[PDB]
């Protein structure tokens, strides 16, 4: 019982670590992708031309 309840907290805290890391990982991909997108779309087409 003690080991099962001490699994219950740390496994959900490991889920919580994954939740923090998912939010950080999505906002890493998302913030760079949209920000990069605003700068880039007209300029990338021009570079290919050159």
């Amino acid at each position: 019982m003690l080991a099962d309840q001490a699994e219950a907290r740390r496994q959900k805290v490991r889920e919580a670590r994954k939740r923090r890391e998912e939010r950080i990982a999505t906002k890493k991909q998302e913030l760079i992708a949209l920000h990069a997108k605003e700068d880039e779309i007209a300029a990338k087409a021009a570079t290919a031309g050159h």
């Binding site: 760079i32 920000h35 990069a36 605003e38 700068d39 880039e40």
Partner: protein
Amino acid sequence: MAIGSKIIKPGGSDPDDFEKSIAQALVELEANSDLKPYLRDLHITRAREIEFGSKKAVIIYVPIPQQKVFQKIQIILVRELEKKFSGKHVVVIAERKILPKPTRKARNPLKQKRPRSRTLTAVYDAILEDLVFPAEIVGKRIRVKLDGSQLVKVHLDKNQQTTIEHKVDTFTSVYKKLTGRDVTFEFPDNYLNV
């Protein structure tokens, strides 16, 4: 989008002028877009200026997970800052807070009553470590004077010391006001393997 002020400058102080100006400088660098993705996460909590007897050194304060990322680029960031912000030697420390083994009236360290790390001198050694980025102090030899004064010889490597060797003199002041103990610089001039 418009990363100016009130974005990269806080978490410390919502003003001032020095902080805001160097914030504008960073944004200029970001425009180059190879620079952009790496640089943007790097937040400045505060900036202070001090003077070594003519010219002022701009010390930067770093939140510390940012520090590892800051370190890799660092020399390119510093060089570009030096030309834009000229006459300033730009130096990086990361803001570490200074904790006590029992100060006072039968009294406490508490908050988190202190692993090895959470104290004084780990910070101090990090202060030498961040100010000198590419050389690294091969020996550090600390003089005590006859008229009860303590003075540190800090011995710089020689490799890529070229960016910090003019800044040797200013490092003395950067140390003196913030950390304190008076520092002098020694090399070994040439790479003599044992």
